[PDB]
Scaffold this active site. Sequence first.
Site, PDB file in Angstrom:
ATOM      1  N   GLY A 115       0.819  -1.220   0.000  1.00  0.00           N
ATOM      2  CA  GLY A 115       0.000   0.000   0.000  1.00  0.00           C
ATOM      3  C   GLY A 115       0.833   1.242   0.000  1.00  0.00           C
ATOM      4  N   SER A 116       0.259   2.353  -0.444  1.00  0.00           N
ATOM      5  CA  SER A 116       0.893   3.684  -0.355  1.00  0.00           C
ATOM      6  C   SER A 116      -0.177   4.748  -0.135  1.00  0.00           C
ATOM      7  CB  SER A 116       1.747   3.994  -1.598  1.00  0.00           C
ATOM      8  OG  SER A 116       0.922   4.233  -2.705  1.00  0.00           O
ATOM      9  N   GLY A 117       0.225   5.866   0.454  1.00  0.00           N
ATOM     10  CA  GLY A 117      -0.628   7.050   0.618  1.00  0.00           C
ATOM     11  C   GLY A 117       0.079   8.104   1.445  1.00  0.00           C
ATOM     12  N   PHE A 127       0.971   8.019   4.392  1.00  0.00           N
ATOM     13  CA  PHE A 127       1.948   7.390   5.316  1.00  0.00           C
ATOM     14  C   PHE A 127       3.280   7.074   4.604  1.00  0.00           C
ATOM     15  CE2 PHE A 127      -1.153   4.296   3.727  1.00  0.00           C
ATOM     16  CZ  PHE A 127      -0.355   3.326   3.145  1.00  0.00           C
ATOM     17  N   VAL A 182       4.612   1.116   1.446  1.00  0.00           N
ATOM     18  CA  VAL A 182       4.908  -0.075   2.284  1.00  0.00           C
ATOM     19  C   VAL A 182       4.994  -1.307   1.388  1.00  0.00           C
ATOM     20  CG1 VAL A 182       4.200  -1.481   4.245  1.00  0.00           C
ATOM     21  CG2 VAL A 182       3.686   0.933   4.262  1.00  0.00           C
ATOM     22  N   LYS A 241       8.709   0.065   5.127  1.00  0.00           N
ATOM     23  CA  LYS A 241       7.987   1.337   4.915  1.00  0.00           C
ATOM     24  C   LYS A 241       8.993   2.422   4.524  1.00  0.00           C
ATOM     25  CE  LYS A 241       4.812   4.476   7.450  1.00  0.00           C
ATOM     26  NZ  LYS A 241       3.770   4.465   8.516  1.00  0.00           N
ATOM     27  N   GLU A 285       7.335  -5.420  11.850  1.00  0.00           N
ATOM     28  CA  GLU A 285       6.666  -6.734  11.989  1.00  0.00           C
ATOM     29  C   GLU A 285       5.565  -6.854  10.929  1.00  0.00           C
ATOM     30  OE1 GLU A 285       3.747  -8.797  15.385  1.00  0.00           O
ATOM     31  OE2 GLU A 285       4.532  -6.698  15.786  1.00  0.00           O
ATOM     32  N   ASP A 324      -6.496  -6.543   7.299  1.00  0.00           N
ATOM     33  CA  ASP A 324      -6.788  -5.311   8.060  1.00  0.00           C
ATOM     34  C   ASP A 324      -8.273  -5.317   8.401  1.00  0.00           C
ATOM     35  OD1 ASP A 324      -8.261  -3.470   6.245  1.00  0.00           O
ATOM     36  OD2 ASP A 324      -6.312  -3.404   5.154  1.00  0.00           O
ATOM     37  N   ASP A 383      -4.829   8.393  15.054  1.00  0.00           N
ATOM     38  CA  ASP A 383      -5.464   7.887  13.801  1.00  0.00           C
ATOM     39  C   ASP A 383      -6.021   6.480  14.054  1.00  0.00           C
ATOM     40  OD1 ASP A 383      -6.395   8.245  11.165  1.00  0.00           O
ATOM     41  OD2 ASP A 383      -4.405   7.696  10.249  1.00  0.00           O
TER      42      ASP A 383
HETATM   43 MG    MG Z   1      -0.877   9.246   9.012  1.00  0.00          MG
END
Ligand code: MG
Length: 273
Positions: free
Chosen positions: A13-15, A17, A20, A35, A89, A96, A135
């Site tokens: 995933g990406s965004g 944050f 990853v 990450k 980890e 999720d 969050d």
């Molecule tokens: Mg954030």
Amino acid sequence: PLESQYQVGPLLGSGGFGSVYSGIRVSDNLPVAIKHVEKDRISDWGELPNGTRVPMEVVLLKKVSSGFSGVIRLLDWFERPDSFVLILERPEPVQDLFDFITERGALQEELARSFFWQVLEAVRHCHNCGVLHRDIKDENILIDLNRGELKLIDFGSGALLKDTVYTDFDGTRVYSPPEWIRYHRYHGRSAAVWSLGILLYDMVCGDIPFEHDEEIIGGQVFFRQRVSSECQHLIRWCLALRPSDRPTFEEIQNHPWMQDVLLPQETAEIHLH
Ligand SMILES: [Mg+2]
């Protein structure tokens, strides 16, 4: 070196944050998440006990590292010229909580209770370590499907916990409280309890209660699924308009709806296996 220590796998995933990747620690074949965060996207910096300059995310992850398995563990980190790399980890198999609720719909109260209890224990751990996550939401909770253990991830919008007002927020708007919407001010604990009310509604109803600013501030919770009177009471208490009317973590865990929780292993056998 980093490229020699870890076999990189596919993008997970990406965004906001960063990006990853799935990965394997070559030494022992341990599953990891890798990450990457661009130095330009980091507003918040801190210092280690080391006295070294790092993203606040690294400071906060080190503060919550311990035996306790309810928060994602930081295994290592690296500074590159234009980025930081965090080695985290990775449970396997994993889903999720956002995806789990999308696939299964509204959870049975027994399963919601087990999950919500584990999230409360993880958030108590963060607060005891001096960390405010900021969050808490289904997308930031991983389920270890074999062990029935939940893990909190994505500390990159978090902060050191303090007793004075926060006037900055870069978490998820629809999990943000009415005092943030109206006044751009919140206190850490009472804003965390709001986000926990949104999460519990999400689990028992299959989606979040509010979409627009006017619903967040309006002071009305409508139940779209059959929810017990005790569970409705807890949710409406977490979502009290006035922050000082919300329960403490102790009052949530002592609530009648929260009694007789399943163990993680029973949760996995009954609900996940
Ligand atoms: Mg954030």
